[PDB]
Amino acid sequence: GSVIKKRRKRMSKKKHRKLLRRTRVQRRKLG
Amino acid sequence: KKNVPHGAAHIKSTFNNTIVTITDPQGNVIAWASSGHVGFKGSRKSTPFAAQLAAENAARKAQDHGVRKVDVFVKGPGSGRETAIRSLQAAGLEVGAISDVTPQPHNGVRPPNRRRV
Amino acid sequence: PRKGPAPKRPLVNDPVYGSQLVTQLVNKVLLKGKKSLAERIVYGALEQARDKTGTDPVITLKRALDNVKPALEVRSRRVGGATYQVPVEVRPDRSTTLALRWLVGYSRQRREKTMIERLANEILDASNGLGASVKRREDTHKMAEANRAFAHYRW
RNA sequence: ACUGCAGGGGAGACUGGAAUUCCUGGUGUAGCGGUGGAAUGCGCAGAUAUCAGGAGGAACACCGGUGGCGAAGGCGGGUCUCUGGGCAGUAACUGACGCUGAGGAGCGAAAGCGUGGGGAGCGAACAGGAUUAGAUACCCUGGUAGUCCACGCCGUAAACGGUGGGUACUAGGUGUGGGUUUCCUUCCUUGGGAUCCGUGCCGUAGCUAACGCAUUAAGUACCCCGCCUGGGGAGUACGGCCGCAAGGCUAAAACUCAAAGGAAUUGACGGGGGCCCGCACAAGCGGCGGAGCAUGUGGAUUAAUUCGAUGCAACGCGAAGAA
Ligand SMILES: [Mg+2]
Ligand SMILES: [Mg+2]
Ligand SMILES: [Mg+2]
Ligand SMILES: [Mg+2]
Ligand SMILES: [Mg+2]
Ligand SMILES: [Mg+2]
Ligand SMILES: [Mg+2]
Ligand SMILES: [Mg+2]
Ligand SMILES: [Mg+2]
Ligand SMILES: [Mg+2]
Ligand SMILES: [Mg+2]
Ligand SMILES: [Mg+2]
Ligand SMILES: [Mg+2]
Ligand SMILES: [Mg+2]
Ligand SMILES: [Mg+2]
Ligand SMILES: [Mg+2]
Ligand SMILES: [Mg+2]
Ligand SMILES: [Mg+2]
Ligand SMILES: [Mg+2]
Ligand SMILES: [Mg+2]
Ligand SMILES: [Mg+2]
Ligand SMILES: [Mg+2]
Ligand SMILES: [Mg+2]
Ligand SMILES: [Mg+2]
Ligand SMILES: [Mg+2]
Ligand SMILES: [Mg+2]
Ligand SMILES: [Mg+2]
Ligand SMILES: [Mg+2]
Ligand SMILES: [Mg+2]
C-alpha cells in the first residue's frame, strides 16, 4: 500500500494549491 | 433516362451504419439506399440485417436505372461488410471485382481521446 | 437444467382414435387430475364436430394444428442497457404444445356457455383459420419478424 | 594522432505522400451522426455518401524491434548543408595531465507565461444533451486556450532502473547491436573460436527483512559527492533568492500520535478471470400481497394483558389443546 503515502502528500499539496488560488490577490499579494 | 450497364458499389460500413452507393465507373452516384433509408433507427442500423436490407434496396434501385454488372469498393470496420456484398449478389448484380478502400492514415490527424467507458 | 436435457414422457395411443395428439391435447386440458372429465370433453368435442365437418375429426384437428403451429418466437434477452427480444426457431414438439396450450387458454375465456362446445367451435374455426389463437399466430409472428434484426444474438 | 565503423545525436533550409477538415463544382436523395440506449447536433435551402479539383495545418503508416543514438530530458517521411558524441584497430605521440566535486553554471518532458505568426485534427475551460437522488463527472454534440512555429521565460515530472559518478575483481548459459582478429578459405558458411564496447533474459557464489539483485550487482573493496535520522504539522509558515505570473529553491517551530511504514503469509472479498453445482434463473403449474375468518407477532390499552423467540435461521415459534 505504498500509494497511500502518495495520496496523503497529494491531498496536502492539493489543499495548499487551493489556498494559494483562493489567495493570489491582495488577500495574499499585499502580504 | 440515364442508362449505364456497368457500375461501382461503394460500401461504407461504420460501427453505427452502412451506406451503399451505386455509381458509374466514372464515379457519379445513381442509387444510394442506406441503412436508415431502409426502416431502421438508432443502434439497429449497425446490424448486419440492416446492412443486407440497405444493400438489397440499393441494388434494386440501381437495377431500375439499368446496372447488371457492379464492382465493389468496401471500406469501414463494420459488421455489414459481407452481408452487404452477398445482398448485392443475390439482388441481381454481378459482383465483378472486389477491393478494399478503407483509408489508412500515414499517422496524420491526431485521433480523438479514448472513451473512458 | 445443468446436466443436459431431461427425458420426455411417452404418451400411448388413444383408444377411440388411433392418434397421439388427442391423448396429448386432453392432458393439456387436464386440471386438478380429472383425466376422465377432460377425456370425455375432448371426445365430445370431436363427436359434436363430425356432424358439422363431414371430414374425420382428427383430420380436422390436424388441419387446425397445422394452422396454429408456431415457427419462430420472440424469446427475450438483455445485453447492455436495454433488454430486447430475439427471434428463435421453435422445434416442432415445443411448437405443437405451445399452440394447443394457447388453444386451451383462449378456450377458457371464449364466449359460450360451457367448454365442450367452446372447444368444439375453437377446433372448427382453427381448422378454418379465423380464431383467437389463429390471430395470435400472425401477431406473434409479426412481432418476431419486426425483431429479426436481433437474430444475430442466438446465445 | 591515424585508419576504419554504426547510429531516429543536434541545428538550418527545401521538399514528399497517405489521411482528417474546409471550399468550389459533378452526381444523387432523406437521411446522417452518435450511444449501453438515446438526445443535443448536422440535412432536406440539398446533408451523409461518391467523383474531380483546390486551400491549409499537424503527424510522419509499412521500415519499426525486445533495436539504435543522446549526459539526462529526449530523437525517425525524404534530400542537402553545418555539426556533437561514441566504438574498434595501429602503437605514431604526451607522459598521471586522472576521479569526484561543496558552492556555481549549463541543459532540462509536459503543462504554463510573454510577443508575433499559424490553427487541420484534437481539446482543459465553457455550453447543450444524456445518465443520475444529485452529476459541477465518466458517455455524446459542439468547442476556447493550448497543442504547431520563431524568439525569450519557466526549471518542474512515477525527470524511475524509484539503483550518483569512477575503478578493480568475483561461475556460467542464452539472445541481440557496433567493431577487430585466427581454423576447414574457397569446405564460402558468410558457419566455429577469441577479444573490445554496448544492450536484454536466466542463473552460481555472495548479499537481502523479504521481494529479489546477481560481471549492466542491490556481491567483494577503495575514492569523492548528494541525501536520511518516527509519522503528521510540512516541503508548509517566516525570512531571503529567482520568476512577468504561475510558482520554484532554501527552509522551521509550536502542537499532536504511538505509531506511521516495507516485504511476505493465511483467509475474506471483488460491479476480476476459469471450471462447475443447486426449483438459482429459464419453460411451465398453482399460489400469497386483495376479501372474510383462524393463529402468532408489533403497537396500543388495561388491573394484568406472564415470559421467552425479532433477517434468512422470530412471528400456526416454545404452546402435541389457557372455561
Ligand atoms: Mg542527425
Ligand atoms: Mg488530399
Ligand atoms: Mg476551415
Ligand atoms: Mg456539394
Ligand atoms: Mg463531399
Ligand atoms: Mg617520453
Ligand atoms: Mg551542486
Ligand atoms: Mg535551460
Ligand atoms: Mg510546451
Ligand atoms: Mg505561447
Ligand atoms: Mg492565461
Ligand atoms: Mg498568440
Ligand atoms: Mg468532450
Ligand atoms: Mg455538461
Ligand atoms: Mg526551427
Ligand atoms: Mg522534485
Ligand atoms: Mg522518462
Ligand atoms: Mg528522487
Ligand atoms: Mg558504484
Ligand atoms: Mg555485455
Ligand atoms: Mg537473476
Ligand atoms: Mg539492500
Ligand atoms: Mg517528527
Ligand atoms: Mg514553498
Ligand atoms: Mg516568502
Ligand atoms: Mg511507506
Ligand atoms: Mg503487502
Ligand atoms: Mg494475499
Ligand atoms: Mg470468484
Ligand SMILES: [Mg+2]
Ligand atoms: Mg431437487
Ligand SMILES: [Mg+2]
Ligand atoms: Mg421462474
Ligand SMILES: [Mg+2]
Ligand atoms: Mg389478505
Ligand SMILES: [Mg+2]
Ligand atoms: Mg408475548
Ligand SMILES: [Mg+2]
Ligand atoms: Mg410452520
Ligand SMILES: [Mg+2]
Ligand atoms: Mg386460567
